[PDB]
Design a binder for this molecule. Structure first.
Ligand SMILES: NC(=O)C1=CN([C@@H]2O[C@H](COP(=O)(O)OP(=O)(O)OC[C@H]3O[C@@H](n4cnc5c(N)ncnc54)[C@H](OP(=O)(O)O)[C@@H]3O)[C@@H](O)[C@H]2O)CCC1
Ligand SMILES: Cc1cc2nc3c(=O)[nH]c(=O)nc-3n(C[C@H](O)[C@H](O)[C@H](O)COP(=O)(O)O)c2cc1C
Length: 364
């Protein structure tokens, strides 16, 4: 089973290639990491296994879900440190995913009910509704298009959160640049209608993600930085006219950051629509992997067998699993044994209970 061959993710010597994908679960009440998170990550941790946390706030304005954790306050750092210690006691490696939702927010989630920020003033279309704190669904509002000074300020929010993650004991951070959130709102030409140096050309649209990645690499080292993108997921109105070329332009900028840094990133993490135009989705995935000088994590609808095939054929170095990890805390061992997997319950993906639908999925 090639899923269980060791892999050197830079300084981190992984014992197997099954990765916990980042997933928002909304148990970090008042944006403070809770003991329930520590139990949840500890359940999933394995010796030498790699975990990526749920998206984590970089600023008071960066949220668009209820009760998601932040890492911009010292109080949050203190509570994260307790979770990281528990996970490190099982021998796992853990990165914190830094997340800004951009225009995918709502007054209820913003300080003083202020407008969310974006590359653009265009709201997400009415085809999408935002989950509200009371469980109803609301309308995505018109965002405020930020200028270049405020862009540099958001970059600094990423830099400070990366340092905070290191202070909490995280092994590294992942830049959330996927799923139509703030970074994807600069990347995709279906969203980014700017006429300054952050819009128009491929190069201009890749400026934001490049500046974020360079900032965090300069703060904590490239080998502690992973980057997640989703060129071909159109979630929250996030489409590009040429996904493969956008993906290849991002990869070129990561390759250059590595050459100029003298060092490799932890990984590039590409995620695709779950229900898959199969062989063509595979085209995109292999083309980005082949373009990128470094470790590649594939994600989106992978099964035990497709994960094995992915590593065996050289298509990916690591495979991340999301939904199956929700309901199988011991997914790694289940994959090793080819043991049958537990169903998950969508109804408790984003509820607040510290146990139900969170830590009470049974082991094998
Ligand atoms: N909470 C989040 O930020 C995200 C939740 N997502 C969930 O990831 C899973 C995979 O997303 P997909 O669009 O690839 O779904 P699929 O039905 O497998 O095709 C779904 O549960 C989806 O609701 C994707 C978008 C961002
Ligand atoms: C409930 C839920 C929450 C998620 N939260 C995040 C997130 O915070 N950041 C992120 O990059 N992806 C997030 N995702 C997407 C997953 O990381 C993963 O890419 C997706 O579920 C597809 O992989 P899978 O088919 O193995 O589930 C989430 C997905 C689900 C279902």
């Amino acid at each position: 089973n090639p899923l269980f061959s060791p892999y050197k993710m830079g300084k981190f010597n992984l014992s197997h290639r099954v990765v916990l994908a980042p997933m928002t679960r909304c148990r970090a009440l008042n944006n403070i990491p809770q003991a329930a998170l520590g139990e949840y990550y500890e359940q999933r941790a394995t010796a030498g296994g790699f975990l990526i946390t749920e998206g984590t706030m970089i600023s008071p304005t960066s949220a668009g879900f209820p009760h998601v954790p932040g890492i911009f306050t010292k109080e949050q750092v203190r509570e994260w440190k307790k979770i990281v210690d528990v996970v490190h006691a099982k021998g796992a490696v853990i990165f914190c995913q830094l997340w800004h939702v951009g225009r995918a927010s709502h007054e209820v989630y913003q300080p003083a009910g202020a407008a969310p920020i974006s590359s653009t003033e265009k709201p997400i279309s009415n085809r999408w509704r935002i989950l509200m704190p009371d469980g109803t669904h609301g309308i995505y509002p018109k965002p405020r298009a930020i200028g270049t000074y405020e862009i540099s300020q958001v970059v600094e929010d990423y830099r400070r959160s990366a340092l905070n993650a290191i202070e909490a004991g995280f092994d590294g951070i992942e830049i959330h640049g996927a799923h139509g959130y703030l970074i994807d709102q600069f990347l995709k030409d279906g969203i980014n209608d700017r006429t300054d140096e952050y819009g128009g050309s491929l190069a201009n649209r890749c400026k934001f993600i490049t500046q974020v990645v360079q900032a965090v690499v300069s703060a904590i080292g490239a080998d502690r930085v992973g980057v997640r993108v989703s060129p071909a997921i159109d979630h929250l109105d996030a489409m590009d006219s040429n996904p493969l070329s956008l993906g290849l332009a991002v990869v070129e900028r990561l390759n250059k950051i590595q050459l100029h840094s003298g060092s490799k990133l932890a990984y590039l993490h590409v995620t695709q629509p779950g229900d898959g135009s199969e062989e063509e989705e595979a085209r995109l995935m292999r083309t980005l992997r082949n373009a990128y000088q470094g470790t590649f994590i594939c994600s989106g609808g992978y099964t035990r067998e497709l994960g094995i095939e992915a590593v065996a054929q050289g298509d990916a170095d690591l495979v991340s699993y999301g939904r199956l990890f929700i309901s199988n805390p011991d997914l790694v061992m289940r994959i090793k044994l080819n043991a049958p997997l537990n169903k998950y319950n969508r109804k408790t993906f984003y509820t607040q209970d510290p146990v139900v639908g969170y830590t009470d999925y049974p082991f094998l």
